[PDB]
Amino acid sequence: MPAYHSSLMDPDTKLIGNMALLPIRSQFKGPAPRETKDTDIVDEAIYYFKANVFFKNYEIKNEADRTLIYITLYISECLKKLQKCNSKSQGEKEMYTLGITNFPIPGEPGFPLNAIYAKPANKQEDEVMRAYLQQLRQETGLRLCEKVFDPQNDKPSKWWTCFVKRQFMNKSLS
């Protein structure tokens, strides 16, 4: 059967490059509009993370799938740093520092999906992309730390750090 795709795409949803500039519920600042609903492109990708890393074939139906694939690849970067953390406060400090890092973007080397992603043509669209992703890289990390850490010991769970070796298909943002 197929993997889990994004249901949130709507024709009224803006496009950046060939991705889906979708609303995000965050206190962080960026080009992403603020959402009112109780579900977002982030809460989905965290719902569907543990299941989508076992599949080996993903068919890109729309552009919101290109936004989900990015997060699902970045969550595997959070867990590499979080498994080394001994307290949630130490994780939130590590999740900040990682989002500030300038990962590759569509068009340049490092990005594993340069072919099936559309780079920004103009410089203004480039500046919007680098600030949309950084808004995802920050709210993703902030929301994992609520889940990874067992409140009984305030230390990472083996049920999340078992997916450290499970890349999305085999790709990584590095």
Interface with another protein by CB under 8 A: which residues?
Answer: 80, 83-86, 155-156, 158, 161, 164, 172, 174
Distances (CA, A) of 140 to 78, 102, 133, 152: 9, 16, 10, 23
Alpha carbons 124 and 126: distance in angstroms, whole number: 5
Contact 98, 91 (CB under 8 A): no
Q: Which is nearer to another protein, 15 or 164 (CB)?
A: 164
| CA-closest candidate to residue 25, choices 133, 139, 131 | 139
> In angstroms, what is the minimal distance from the CB of 41 to another protein?
27
**Which is closer to another protein, CB of 76 or CB of 135?**
76
Compare residues 119 and 155 and give the one whose CB is closer to another protein: 155
User: To the nearest whole angstrom, how small is the minimum distance from the Cβ of residue 85 to another protein?
Assistant: 7
Closer residue to another protein in complex, CB, 51/162: 162
Give the separation between CA 129 and CA 56, rounded to whole angstroms: 27
Rounded to a whole number of angstroms, the minimum distance from the CB of residue 86 to another protein is 6
First to last CA, the chain: 30
Helix (H) / strand (E) element for 91: namely helix 88-100
* Cβ closest to another protein, residue 62 vs residue 167: 167
Shortest Å distance, C-beta 69 to another protein: 18
Least distance in angstroms from the C-beta of 158 to another protein: 6
